[PDB]
Paper text:
We now describe the isolation and characterization of a human monoclonal antibody, 19-77, with a broad but incomplete SARS-CoV-2 neutralization profile. Structural analysis revealed that 19-77 recognized the spike RBD in the “up” position, and its epitope overlapped with the ACE2 footprint. These modifications resulted in greater flexibility of the complementarity-determining regions (CDRs) of the heavy chain while binding to the viral spike, thereby enabling three 19-77Δ variants to neutralize all SARS-CoV-2 strains tested with much improved potency and breadth, including against the JN.1 sublineages.
The primary interaction between the 19-77 heavy chain and the RBD was mediated by CDRH1 and CDRH2, with hydrogen bonds to A475, N487, Y473, D420, and Y421. The CDRH3 region formed two hydrogen bonds with the RBD: one between R97 and the backbone carbonyl of N487, and another between E102 and Y489. On the other hand, the 19-77 light chain made contact with the apical ridge of the RBD via its CDRL1 and CDRL3. The antibody footprint of 19-77 on the RBD largely overlapped with the human ACE2 receptor-binding site. Sequence conservation analysis indicated that most regions of its epitope are relatively conserved, except for the upper half of the left shoulder, which exhibits significant sequence variations at residues 455, 456, 475, 478, and 486. We then hypothesized that R71 might restrict the motion of CDRH1 and CDRH2 of 19-77, and that mutating this arginine could lead to greater antibody flexibility.
Author numbering:
A (entry chain A): 1 to 115
B (entry chain B): 1 to 108
C (entry chain C): 335 to 527
Write the structure that this text describes.
């Protein structure tokens, strides 16, 4: 089975910003449809953003202009620049790769926002 | 925008039983729907796609039925390992789209 | 006069990944019969305006014809993005011409889904304006070889639309025709009266 592997989990505050990362074992992140999805404790899944194979990229109305998806083709890696946070942006964030018949999720990484 | 309602919130059947998990859509989304499993502390896993197709490596006991506005994941017999949270998602702008609030299985 | 009314009143239509072009010339076309249409759900124009076309002569019209899902009509506009614009049929940001579409549920939907119509899902990079790609190269999404047939992390690059009856208006098939115009200073076999 393919492993996609998040990193950059940790802590921030109100006001601040963070950046998540992901890598993949046996797939090319630039060739795939790749997304971020989050799951806050005691709440449902929120799909955040996607980058298509040719680099077209899209966002949920809840977060347009706060968070920004991007990738580096050379490192085989995906990034979620995650700015201007609040306490409620605390969640596990999952990197996920999609194909017509398959959907490969990473183990997820925690982000927490407080004092 | 579309929103998805799942019924029940918590199911409470024993192992061996046939199970049905229900999803209803705020719009006629055709066949464009997904179901995921999620074990506690694991990431979600794809079960069903396009309302009815079964993903590779998912056991044949899972199935998807319904269309348009009404959808059902159905399990021919609950294994003890099938006790999980289950999420529907509309994929009408694939891979984007809204999730359900999810459904649990628990007993005592 | 001109083929336009036959491109519109046509029985068969093309899949968007292999979008089919008519070269028009030798011509004298009545665009007012086009914008008089009761079937046309959409008749966008860029640069030009519908009532002006009988004043404008041209070297050439290309009429491009294909079927897409009814909400993907949004993507058939200058400089747009989304799967159809990105991977099947791109209009340039400086497009001059018109985009015509109508619901074809009665022709192109079939019971249990019409699987005959397709779109390209996978491409290493976005399309150039008016580019076309009819290839069936097996798409190498994995880091490893893939070598001519689909399997573990590689795919047939097209997806079938499966157009159903009922099933929501945005998800029904729409026939699209795009009228595009070209100029290099010579032989204007297109005009009004």
């Amino acid at each position: 089975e393919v492993q996609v592997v998040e990193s950059g989990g940790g802590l921030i505050q109100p006001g601040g910003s963070l950046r998540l990362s992901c890598t993949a074992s046996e797939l090319i992140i630039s060739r795939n449809y790749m997304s971020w999805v989050r799951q806050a404790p005691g709440k449902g899944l929120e799909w955040l953003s996607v980058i298509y194979p040719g680099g077209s990229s899209f966002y949920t109305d809840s977060l347009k202009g706060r968070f920004t998806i991007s990738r580096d083709n050379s490192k085989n890696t995906l990034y979620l620049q995650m700015n201007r946070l609040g306490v409620e942006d605390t969640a596990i964030y999952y990197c996920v790769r999609d194909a017509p018949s398959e959907s490969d999720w990473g183990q997820g990484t925690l982000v927490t926002v407080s004092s | 925008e579309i929103v998805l309602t799942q019924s029940p919130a918590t199911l409470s059947l024993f192992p061996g039983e046939r199970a049905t998990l229900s999803c209803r859509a705020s719009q006629n989304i055709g066949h464009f729907l997904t179901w995921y499993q999620q074990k506690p502390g694991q990431a979600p896993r794809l079960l069903i796609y396009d309302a009815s197709n079964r993903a590779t490596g998912v056991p044949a006991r899972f199935s998807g039925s319904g269309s348009e506005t009404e959808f059902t994941l159905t399990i021919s017999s609950l294994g003890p390992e099938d006790f999980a949270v289950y999420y529907c998602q509309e994929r009408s702008d694939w891979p984007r789209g809204t999730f359900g609030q999810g459904t649990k299985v628990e007993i005592k | 006069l001109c083929p336009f009314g036959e491109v519109f009143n046509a029985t068969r239509f093309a899949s968007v990944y292999a979008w089919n072009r008519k070269r028009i010339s030798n011509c004298v076309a009545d665009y007012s019969v086009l914008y008089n249409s009761a079937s046309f759900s959409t008749f966008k124009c860029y640069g030009v305006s519908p009532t002006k076309l009988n004043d404008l002569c041209f070297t050439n019209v290309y009429a491009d014809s294909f079927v897409i899902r009814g909400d993907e009509v949004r993507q058939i506009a200058p400089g747009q993005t989304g799967k159809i614009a990105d991977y099947n049929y791109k209009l340039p940001d400086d497009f001059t011409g018109c985009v015509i579409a109508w619901n074809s549920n009665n022709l192109d939907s079939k019971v249990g889904g019409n699987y005959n119509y397709l779109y390209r899902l996978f491409r290493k990079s976005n399309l150039k304006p008016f580019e076309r790609d009819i290839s069936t190269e097996i798409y190498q999404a994995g880091s490893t070889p893939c070598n001519g047939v689909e399997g573990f992390n590689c795919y047939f690059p097209l997806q079938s639309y499966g157009f159903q009856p009922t099933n929501g208006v945005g998800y029904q098939p729409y026939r699209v025709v795009v009228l595009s115009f070209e100029l290099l200073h010579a032989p204007a076999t297109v005009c009004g009266p």
